[PDB]
């Protein structure tokens, strides 16, 4: 921070002394279930070399868990959310470029334990028939504990260059009625993948033996609200001072299929079966600093 | 945040120098057994490019966990709460849009550790007889733990539009009397599910053996309060400057009911039995800046 | 929040400049032993469309934790607070409402947390009379626990109108000399209810066989102190600028019996026993802005 | 801090009452795939010795975790990250001076518990031949845990002087699939290096038995965020008021095969096999207070 | 604090309406590797009794863990920090005098637990010869925890007069791939000490078997940031207002050897084998407030 | 706090408006080493109805455990500081009084934690001869941890009168290489008091046998720096505006003793042997506001 340099907090921010013009821009996309908002800021700041444009993408991205097949009472599918992805992107002959951008990726940690033990005991035995027997015992053990953090998706900023930048919210693991986890490639040569199944054995149809979504991870079926900022910069003396940009709302989906094997639920799922992409084209005006759609 | 991206604190943030309007409308109805205050504030930034509104839902749905039938001594039911809703939604011929909104949906988390455990052991035994024997063990262990946080209610944000935005607040589980915990599919092959059954075997009549709701979550009994908030943005130049929202307050019970099985007690329960829904028109005017019912 | 809106923190809040009318009313009800406090603070924001008042009930209701029965060392009574309650209550001609109160309720968590582990062993046998043994065991174990916490008393909201609200802070459970804790509800068949059990066969006068007070939950004896929040409002249009509100506080003792079965002592507690209250009646001017009683 | 010495806090800071001249310069090395970015501030505090320039480098080094080599089912390539390099570097013929740099490098610690047991029981045995027995155990032993905290990469400030300072973010273990976790020198006679092996025995092409991205270290494939600041001072009496200052952004990779053994893989890790290097050449002008490239 | 004794925070703080004056004197040692930065804050409070000038010195010594030797292929010595250290001194002829430093010695802390354990068990047992067995026994145990942390490296305050002050971060102990913790003393009779020992009895040369820095703390090879203050007093009238200080920066390395004994390899640790000090003096002048070298 | 009963932050401090005559007087006394420096400011709030003087005593008390007397080679002893104090007195005649002091005494807690575990189990037995067994067990087992913290050495307010006050930071216990933790009392009847018994059975001078001061608590060594606040009061139509006030710093010092038993060493402690004071007048002008040594 600037105090761990001997500066004053604050001194090196952008920004102070400026008037900024926000918006909103809000779009509703009925085919791939998608809510999505841009809140931009533009900052002139005259001490500045650049002139800068916070762009930040919220809205949500409905999770769409659904039983889109039923082939009898013995097979059907699920379509559910792996993926959710955000990306902003603007054309190569534009002079603007991407500055800064928040959330990025970070190193994640894990925490280590070791433990030596050992001990000695000493034991004496007899009987009514006057008997006497004794146990001189010793031991010793080694044990390695490893303990770590895992969320349920998995946030990450995929790698910028000066004209995109994108991030992607994907499936990790989940507990399935405190079993588990199950993850897209969990597998049991008996029941196969059990990440949605509600009963191993059931005199129920397919369409009833999947997990009720009240139960799975709320961004499988409810959705995922997304908060990412990118900043964009651009040159005072450039010749274009109107910028296109394309933002894209995105979620991947796979396929879970059960089924019986008359003894009891298998399970399968395939990834990355369908992708519902969302995308949109803004306007970027530097001198009147106001963005359109 | 802000100075995650070398940005002066709150530089982004709409409202400064700006007179806000607020207002509370509070309403009760008996029937239904809700408190209903909305509490709004009208923005008009100069600055972004939209007017804005901001409605915060509170208030209170009244729990109602009520013994509602008694079927002589063996049977009787149970009427809960397993959810609570609160809903807003503009007339698809509206203008105005439904920008933002809190809370959203959370990414949850699980502790995972893995544990390696490997030890030997020498033993040395004898008798008064001068036997003599000995004992020489080795061992290997593989342990796995999964943690995890369970709320008594999961509070969720359904997947908006822009013109419709709502939560839900679900029954997850709960314990009962240090055990469980039990939620609405809990199934005890002798016992169903136990979720509010006071004693197994005790001797009573069925409309005394309910939990008493002092013990269970105050939710079930008392009523939650809700506090969300939405955000509601308006061009400058629509044609129409009225806008009229409708919001909506909803308990859904269940049915819990407690059985005689010359044995034991049988709980059963059936699901999302009851609606209560109370349903209000509020009348937006972007002009005077000003909210009424 | 207002920052999780994008908005900046603080613009939505009342209050901002306006002179703020404040007071106290203080009054000691001696029969019942509750010491009332009551303030009051007057907001008209200009800018809001009604006149707040905040009232805040606090002072502190006496515990009362008593040994009021004596039979000769055989059995003996012991009358202790199982609650705790204050309420205010607007008459239904009055044209102000409640509109919002704190604290509220809060959904309450626990801790998952399931164990699969599982090993293998192999031991080698021999003696001085050149024989050998031999020894392959292997195992499994799952567990389970849940961890909660659990306070002695629970405050809770209870269902508000918008004529009235009110809060009852219960007796929980408590531990007894390091063991239980206990409920009103425990029960053992040789002892009975151990809740206020100094000891089991203890051969003193009944009425010296219950728990030191300084040794239980504070609030059994020395009282509670409340600090709840009201907020009434009201039209600036209304045709009567005045207000009746009664304001009840109210302690609820339970009947804790210890008696001797010629081997040990034996526990019973009669819940709800008494019921004392002191309810008071305020004027509200909203013209003066002061509250009288 | 400055109030540990009896200091107004703030008081021995840079930084107050200077117009401070801030700028950004936006790269991208297509070649390289490293989006870097320079965010600079001049501080002309006159009230401070020196003029100064804080100098953030930001951006992101993509990760590029890739199955390089295809030679067969039986044998593959996979080159991944093992360090990301920031350097600064002024060349040894310049006046301007590196006073500081954050982060820094910190002390690690480790928790450590010592553990002393020792009990005795006693055993009676008999049967229905009218038999009796003995046992009387005793038994000691003593445990021994020590705990830290191990992240993927560790942040390290390389051994700076007033002409060249720079930071590198190692590899320096990581969990594969709840075991491990492994690391650049990892070896099991049996399976090599099982850094990134997804199966140890599976029917696969070598290079499809590689660990999933989504599963390994996000830095792995999708990069690394750098966010480092160094501070150069200058005299304001200094005869060439322009420098030089030459950044580079690294990639160093590492090597890992997978190849059959026949009835098992076995993983192979060759350290730093290759370096990508994207070197630049920044202006600083300390009389116009900008930098350019 | 301020506020524990009735008084307004911040009210007995020096430096306010006081204009202060800065400096940063950068100094690199080539034949040392010490990066040395003074950054120095003369503050003239005109109501405090002295002119105060507060020193903070900060930049890094370089660790140097050196393999400086190799007598063959059987015997190798690394040169490993021990020791940093940071010295102030002012001429005993001088008028100014040391009057707080900071950091200072902070009181360790130790986490103690007892446990006191008992317990029967009761086992049947009998075979289809008919028998019939029988086991009561009993047991208790006492056990004890002793928990505390281990910081790789210490920061002690050395015992300050009024003419000197230094601050020595000295090395405690380290983990050598999951084990150890070993110190400068550790001692294991087939293996010598084993701090910085690869393998135990591997096949190569002695200056090939040393810890790979990556893998030890970071300040034995990057080195050490200090970041220590030391505030020094001055009379108004004071004949004399010009002094000079000398500042030295320290490395104290220690000889660890390896010697191949044809079976396995010994470790040896020499302790305090070399000093690197380097010395530096400076002028303050306080009727200029400046501060030179 | 001034929040809980309804006031505004701060509004009842003292300093509000008031010019702060701040100083520092530092003194060292070579022989005792001790650093002493006291920071005072006078408080001259003219609506509250005293003079105020808040005094600051800081500095350091050099530790200097050191080996006194080398008595053979098997005979030794060892002077440590056991505590560590600072006194201010105020004559008798003084009318000036002792109104605050910081830090005071404060409750220590400890975690406490009750067990009940009981389980069953079953064993079914056979082998080729056809023969059959049994085995039915049950147990039980009531466990009690306790768990707390201690400090290496405690700080401690003694009882104040209004003409003196101070505090006496005195050695607790202290953990010797991994065990222990030893103090003042602790004693081993094979080795005595092992508090700095580097070995137990070595083969060294016994001057070569204490705990390296390097691995025990750095106040033993270094020494320890005060830091306790005193606020004196006067009133302001006092006779005479003068005060004089003694201020003392002490270190205790104790023997340990180390002696060869020629089969293990033995160690013994005698408590408080020495006592080194260093005292100090000042006058307290209140006419002036300052203060003089």
């Given at each position: 921070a600037d105090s761990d340099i001997n500066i004053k907090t604050g001194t090196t921010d952008i920004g102070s002394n400026t008037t900024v013009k926000t918006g909103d821009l809000v779009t509703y996309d009925k085919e791939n279930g998608m809510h999505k908002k841009v809140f931009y800021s533009f900052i002139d700041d005259k001490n500045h070399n650049k002139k800068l444009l916070v762009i930040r993408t919220k809205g949500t991205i409905a999770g769409?868990?659904?039983?889109?097949?039923?082939?009898?009472?013995n097979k059907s599918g699920l379509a559910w959310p792996s993926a959710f992805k955000v990306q902003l992107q603007l054309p190569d002959?534009?002079?603007?470029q991407i500055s800064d951008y928040y959330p990025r990726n970070s190193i994640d940690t894990k925490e280590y334990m070791s433990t030596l033990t050992y001990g000695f005991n000493g034991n004496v035995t007899g009987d009514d028939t006057g008997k006497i027997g004794g146990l001189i015992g010793a031991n010793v053990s080694i044990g390695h504990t490893l303990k770590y953090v895992q969320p349920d998706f998995k946030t990450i900023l995929e790698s910028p260059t000066d004209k995109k930048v994108g991030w992607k919210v994907i499936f990790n693991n989940m507990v399935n009625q405190n079993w588990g986890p199950y993850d897209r490639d969990s597998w049991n040569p008996v029941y196969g993948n059990q990440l949605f199944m509600k009963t191993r054995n059931g005199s129920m149809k397919a369409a009833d033996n999947f997990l009720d979504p009240n139960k799975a991870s709320s961004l499988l079926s409810s959705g995922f609200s997304p908060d990412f900022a990118t900043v964009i910069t651009m040159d005072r003396?450039?010749?274009?001072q109107q910028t296109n940009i394309d933002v894209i709302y995105e979620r991947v989906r796979d396929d879970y299929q059960l089924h019986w094997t008359s003894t009891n639920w298998k399970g399968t799922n395939t990834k990355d079966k369908w992708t519902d992409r969302s995308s949109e084209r803004y306007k970027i005006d530097w001198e009147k600093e106001e963005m359109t759609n």
């Open positions: 769409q868990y659904r039983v889109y097949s039923e082939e009898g009472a002959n534009e002079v603007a003396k450039a010749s274009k």
